[PDB]
Design a protein around this ligand. Sequence first.
Ligand SMILES: CCCCCCCC/C=C/CCCCCCCC(=O)O[C@H](COC(=O)CCCCCCCCCCCCCCC)COP(=O)(O)OC[C@@H](O)CO
Ligand SMILES: CCCCCCCC/C=C/CCCCCCCC(=O)O[C@H](COC(=O)CCCCCCCCCCCCCCC)COP(=O)(O)OC[C@@H](O)CO
Ligand SMILES: CCCCCCCC/C=C/CCCCCCCC(=O)O[C@H](COC(=O)CCCCCCCCCCCCCCC)COP(=O)(O)OC[C@@H](O)CO
Ligand SMILES: CCCCCCCC/C=C/CCCCCCCC(=O)O[C@H](COC(=O)CCCCCCCCCCCCCCC)COP(=O)(O)OC[C@@H](O)CO
Ligand SMILES: CCCCCCCC/C=C/CCCCCCCC(=O)O[C@H](COC(=O)CCCCCCCCCCCCCCC)COP(=O)(O)OC[C@@H](O)CO
Lengths: 311, 311, 311, 311, 311
Amino acid sequence: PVDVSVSIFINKIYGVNTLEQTYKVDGYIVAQWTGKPRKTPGDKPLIVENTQIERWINNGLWVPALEFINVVGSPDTGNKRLMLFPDGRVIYNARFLGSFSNDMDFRLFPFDRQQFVLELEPFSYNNQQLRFSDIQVYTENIDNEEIDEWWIRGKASTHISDIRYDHLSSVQPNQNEFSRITVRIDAVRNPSYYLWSFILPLGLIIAASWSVFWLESFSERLQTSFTLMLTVVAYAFYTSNILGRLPYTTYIDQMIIAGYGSIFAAILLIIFAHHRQANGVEDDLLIQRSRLAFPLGFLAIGCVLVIRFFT
Amino acid sequence: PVDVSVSIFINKIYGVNTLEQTYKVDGYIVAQWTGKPRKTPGDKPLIVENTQIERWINNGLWVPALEFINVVGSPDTGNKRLMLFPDGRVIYNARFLGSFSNDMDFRLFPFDRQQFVLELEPFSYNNQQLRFSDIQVYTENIDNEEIDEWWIRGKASTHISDIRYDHLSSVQPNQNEFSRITVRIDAVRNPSYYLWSFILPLGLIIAASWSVFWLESFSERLQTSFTLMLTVVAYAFYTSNILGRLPYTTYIDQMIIAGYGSIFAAILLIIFAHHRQANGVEDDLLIQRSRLAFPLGFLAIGCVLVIRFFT
Amino acid sequence: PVDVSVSIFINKIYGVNTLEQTYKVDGYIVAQWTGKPRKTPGDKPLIVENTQIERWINNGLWVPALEFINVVGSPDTGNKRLMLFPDGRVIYNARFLGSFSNDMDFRLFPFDRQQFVLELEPFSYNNQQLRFSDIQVYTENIDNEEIDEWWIRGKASTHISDIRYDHLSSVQPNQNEFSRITVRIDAVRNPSYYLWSFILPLGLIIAASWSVFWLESFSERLQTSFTLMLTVVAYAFYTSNILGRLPYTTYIDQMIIAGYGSIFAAILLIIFAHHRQANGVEDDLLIQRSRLAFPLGFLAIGCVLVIRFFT
Amino acid sequence: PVDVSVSIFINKIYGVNTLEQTYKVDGYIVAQWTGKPRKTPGDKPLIVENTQIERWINNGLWVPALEFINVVGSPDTGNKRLMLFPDGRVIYNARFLGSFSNDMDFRLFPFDRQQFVLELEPFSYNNQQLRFSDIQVYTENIDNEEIDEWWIRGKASTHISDIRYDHLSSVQPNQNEFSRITVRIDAVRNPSYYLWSFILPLGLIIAASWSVFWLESFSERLQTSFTLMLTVVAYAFYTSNILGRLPYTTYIDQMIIAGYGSIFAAILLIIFAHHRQANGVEDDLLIQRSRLAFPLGFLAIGCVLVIRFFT
Amino acid sequence: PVDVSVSIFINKIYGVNTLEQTYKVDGYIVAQWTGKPRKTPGDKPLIVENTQIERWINNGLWVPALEFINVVGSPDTGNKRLMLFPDGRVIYNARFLGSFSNDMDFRLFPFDRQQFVLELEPFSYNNQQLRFSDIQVYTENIDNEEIDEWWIRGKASTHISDIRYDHLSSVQPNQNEFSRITVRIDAVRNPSYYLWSFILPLGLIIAASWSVFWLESFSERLQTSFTLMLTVVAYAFYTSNILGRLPYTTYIDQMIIAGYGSIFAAILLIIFAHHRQANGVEDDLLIQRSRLAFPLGFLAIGCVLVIRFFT
Ligand SMILES: CCCCCCCC/C=C/CCCCCCCC(=O)O[C@H](COC(=O)CCCCCCCCCCCCCCC)COP(=O)(O)OC[C@@H](O)CO
Ligand SMILES: CCCCCCCC/C=C/CCCCCCCC(=O)O[C@H](COC(=O)CCCCCCCCCCCCCCC)COP(=O)(O)OC[C@@H](O)CO
Ligand SMILES: CCCCCCCC/C=C/CCCCCCCC(=O)O[C@H](COC(=O)CCCCCCCCCCCCCCC)COP(=O)(O)OC[C@@H](O)CO
Ligand SMILES: CCCCCCCC/C=C/CCCCCCCC(=O)O[C@H](COC(=O)CCCCCCCCCCCCCCC)COP(=O)(O)OC[C@@H](O)CO
Ligand SMILES: CCCCCCCC/C=C/CCCCCCCC(=O)O[C@H](COC(=O)CCCCCCCCCCCCCCC)COP(=O)(O)OC[C@@H](O)CO
């Protein structure tokens, strides 16, 4: 095979769409291999711009078609240069811009760790004809940087693996294993916006529904409760606008469901108290003092939900 | 005719849009046929990358144009390679990315079974000039995998049929029947998100409107009812944001309409009771005990709606 | 001129967008004419695929550029084949995919009849140089089929007309009249979704506001009314999300305005009754019995609004 | 220079987007000039379709690149024909489809006059090398026609001006002035949809808040007021969905702000009356009769807001 | 190296999207350098239009590929001309249309200063082979002009820097430093729309919740408060529709959170007063006079929030 050394420079990561779990990566790819020696005007390396690589390929020069595996749509290719050397080494540099997809797990939604994956692979040549010798990813432009709500933590881990393709087994009998480069850039979500923007109003709503226990009249303890209940219920599709329609519950929507149960338990408790308060004064010392025992219960539920993340 | 053996490798299925009933399928297609023997540099199969297939077709090599029938828009074609053999067999491999449409039935919306269909057909040649000998679809990448809310269950059933085209009957008198490959991938919807996200809040709303019967004062039994009624009524267009504007009712919207009827029957019953309660105490033993008979009625209605699916 | 016989096969009609009154039509177009006799390899008709029609046109073969007049954007052209005969007849088949616009009238919105129009015309040649001899549209794939909410009723009426172009009068002095093919496919909207999804909740709301007359206390007859009034008022922009911002009123929004007037007349009537009820018991036998005369008035208004459609 | 006579046929104007103040114009452009005489097959004018104009330009024929100045994105060019004459005149006809931008003023939003502007200019040649002799715009297809909510009033005024470009002053020392054609099509907005859809519900809301003065109990005069106030306040972003986030106030949003002030003044007046009604019956003859003086004040405010438009 | 003198004419800046912090810039770029002298027809500079620059590059003419660094997507290139001189200077003019991204800081959202940045750089040649001699940006078309809500203040500051690329260090050992042009156009946001559209309704809401202290009955002082609280709480995602999901708080959302705290403190204060008002008249002179001390507290909080911007 031929040894192709790749350098991926990530200019920027933007447009991290969690609805379809895609992220737009812009950058440059530099694939360098060695071939037969050639003659150039002078002895400098010859630069062939875009549109002219086709003329050199029609002349007979071997240029591999490296593709992105985890891309959504076709990648936008900007300029591409082909830099040839007198000693015989060929360099193919190209600006890629692609919507790449990765399987993202949102079970811890505000406090979230994901990774952006770039999968690069020869389209035609298996590792018996093209082997990726090494890759260094030069992600210094976004190495420690918040893009929209994602901090980029750590370095980009680079792996070179080999993927067996069963669909090419009939057309290539015993050589269908393709060299592949995987670039992982770990990202940690910034939970600050959800903290001041959704956790805080829902916290004031839940605290206000704690406060409706401290009232004396039944005309205000049930109507308010119902207004606060339906206000929490209206927040059901908050994460489905940010994330997809996920089968699991995040932390935000579990807090919303805890709000459902809290206001519903409050409503049922107060309705039961007024129903047993029919045939007289009918006042017990326990229910009137349950105004302070209910926020403690919600705090215990919140703590036992956090403690799973804490361990 | 010539025997074209197809292999479709499905890399991923994503973007399953139920608004227009489309789904984006990315993959590779490998069509293999045999022609006259040819000479190549050495005796290895010769790989012709993209942009160079046109030169070989202008030279005179026969490459069929296989198209996708059920596609929305034009399919994005990534790289395409053409691998020629000394013994004469030609292989056309191409990365397709297409928005494909299938007729989807959403009469059982959360608990839903659909299928993703790929229809592949020669654009020009009928089965007297090009016959699909066989197809194997290598869908191992998504064989048992949840993509967004769809589990992929079972294998991809592959069929080769022949479609008669009446519009080509005048231009091709007695040979207008085209070979076609249909690939069906069955998918089952994950109902979990609708269970914790819409079934649960609507269940608490309906249970709270059961609970308003247990009140004593008329100032709270009608106002609450109306707030809960309009809260359920505001959920009318929930499925039309997920599905289209379907002429039939799903299970979610039938539950919403059952909510309409339940709160409306509650409101009418309580209004009638207070209207017949004009000229005295006017209390009957039946209406005051109908607080427990109404959730049983709603549970019976829910059970008889489920039992149609159960059989 | 030359006689060009067209066959339009409509594969599917999808994406019927009533916001900008466009609809996406996918299909095949087969234009057949006769020229000078030619020689082909063997005596079979020669099939020239895409990309190779340009070589034959550069050789000197006459291929007209047929365009779509009522298209939005540029039409997506898939594969195109050019099938030449030894006896001299030329066939140009091409897969078109276009967003076509038609002037749609939504004055009867749920109960709506529209038509999808395909306008096809030579771009360069007037009817002195290219005449459309006949067209048959093979719309058997969608002949009796509901696509999203449109039933396709009847056959596709095909017309061949001639359009005079005044802008080409200076460059072509007395021959600027172009042959044109118009294909009309009549469609009838399915009103079922609006019936169970918007007509039903608004009907229960209007019936509940009929029911608030049956109350006795003023604290409930005005507040409820106002809640139901603002609930109906919030439905003003329901059709503007489905249709455009139309200058006329449909049936849905006239029902919404009838709701406005009904709840407002109820509110004004009850406020006037309580204002004249100041200086005593002040009870008249007419207003207390107007609880049953108001739904009859709304039913009469609905009937006289329907009877215009009935005639 | 050479005299280029332009004819712009506007097929349709559609997609008038007031969010970014763009409008999609579809049409044909016919630019006619005269060159050296040439020989054609026979003596008829020779029609060169798309794809073949490039061959004639490579042969050496002068075809100018006319561009659109006020376009958003790149214009979609459909077919283009090049019609050459034996006497030497060259005609370039091309179907353009472009999103064009014009500076739109929405200070009178429902009752609005705008104009759609097409700016056409040679890309390379200044007026010393290419002068636009005349233009006639053949806008008979939309001459008196409502497209979405815009009536096209009057004819399309056509102007030929000359624009000096300072950026080309260094590369072209004393000849950087380019001929330009501006086509203005005046349009008047249809206010009907806003009249029956937003003016009417807001009018009933404001009239209902006039009607809450006629009540006797304080428990209904403040709560209702607040519900109607927040209903009007929820309509703040109505125009920002139709127009942009404009720095000025239209007529709709000034009516909304007048609603704000009216309900707020009502709320403050009633709260002040009940606060001064503390130490007794405390009833004055003026405030109880201000129920009729407040709608007169709002009508005077509306009239003095209209009278600026009236003059 | 060769000295390339650039002139960027900004036709318009439009589509300033603050969700992904991009802005669409349309304009012309004129890059002028000097090469070997050449012969042209006559002695005028020869203009080579689009499509023909490729023929001259294949002939052997050196045309650099200048790219935009901060672009989102691939830039739309309209017409491009190549104007050659007999004395040897080459001019490449091209209409660019690009979505450019800049890091925007929205910590002062209505009262906001940003800058639109155009970064231009040779794709292939480092500053040892191509140096940008100077740039003048001719932004007279938008020099003092409001586009959507941005005033363009000042001139466009132009800088020529040199960027070292580590990813090109292996392929170019000691010459990987590329010349770059950065064009900054400062823009100041127009806060007027947020002033009359969001600041004003929220101000009336906060003033109305000041006014609910002036009431006497507890049935109106808590329910109203809760309605106004939830009305303010519903405005949490106002800026996330305009800006992104920013980790920091702007001025609008800090005003919203101040609204949260104000209504919540009002609700808690009134609930505490009624809870301590259990065992008698229980009236203190301080709480009843706190109706006027609470808006002063909110004004002090607003002033101390403004005074950070004031310094
Ligand atoms: C003791 C101290 C005071 C406490 C009193 C108030 C407390 C009331 C608690 C409410 C629930 C608390 C749990 C909060 C978080 C719950 C959120 C949660 O865990 O998930 C949902 C559970 O379903 C649920 O909750 C459903 C549970 C019902 C929620 C409504 C509760 C109201 C109960 C009526 C009141 C009782 C009256 C007493 C009657 C005697 C469903 O996720 P899902 O399916 O995707 O799983 C699959 C996925 O996890 C992996 O694929
Ligand atoms: C007995 C125990 C207690 C029960 C008391 C409360 C129970 C009240 C029941 C309400 C309805 C229950 C059904 C729930 C599911 C109903 C949903 C449903 O089946 O579909 C809709 C039916 O229309 C409908 O419902 C319309 C039915 C009306 C809904 C409102 C009901 C309020 C009735 C006023 C109160 C009565 C007062 C008593 C007066 C004497 C329309 O689908 P569509 O057209 O697409 O078909 C075509 C498609 O199926 C195939 O193409
Ligand atoms: C008698 C039995 C009981 C009845 C009592 C309740 C009944 C109250 C009726 C309300 C209106 C009924 C009509 C319903 C349908 C009305 C809908 C309608 O026809 O259209 C709108 C009419 O404007 C309108 O309605 C505006 C009419 C006003 C609507 C509000 C009515 C409340 C009246 C205050 C209460 C009266 C108190 C009595 C005071 C003495 C405007 O379309 P537009 O411009 O595009 O035309 C152009 C286009 O048609 C062709 O280009
Ligand atoms: C006398 C008869 C009865 C009347 C009693 C009720 C009447 C109450 C009137 C309310 C306002 C009426 C004006 C209605 C239209 C106002 C709309 C308007 O003119 O624009 C806004 C004005 O700001 C405004 O209004 C702000 C004004 C405040 C609005 C709220 C008013 C409530 C006042 C509290 C009650 C008073 C209690 C009495 C206390 C002693 C801001 O546009 P903007 O910046 O883009 O300009 C730049 C742009 O114009 C050019 O670039
Ligand atoms: C004295 C005169 C009368 C006053 C009485 C009423 C006044 C009540 C004040 C409310 C808060 C006032 C602050 C208003 C602006 C606050 C907005 C703000 O500063 O930001 C948020 C602060 O969190 C917050 O506020 C959270 C604070 C809580 C908000 C709710 C307050 C209700 C308190 C319950 C009532 C007390 C009862 C008394 C009990 C004894 C979070 O930004 P974030 O994270 O992105 O930072 C990172 C970023 O800044 C840089 O990356």
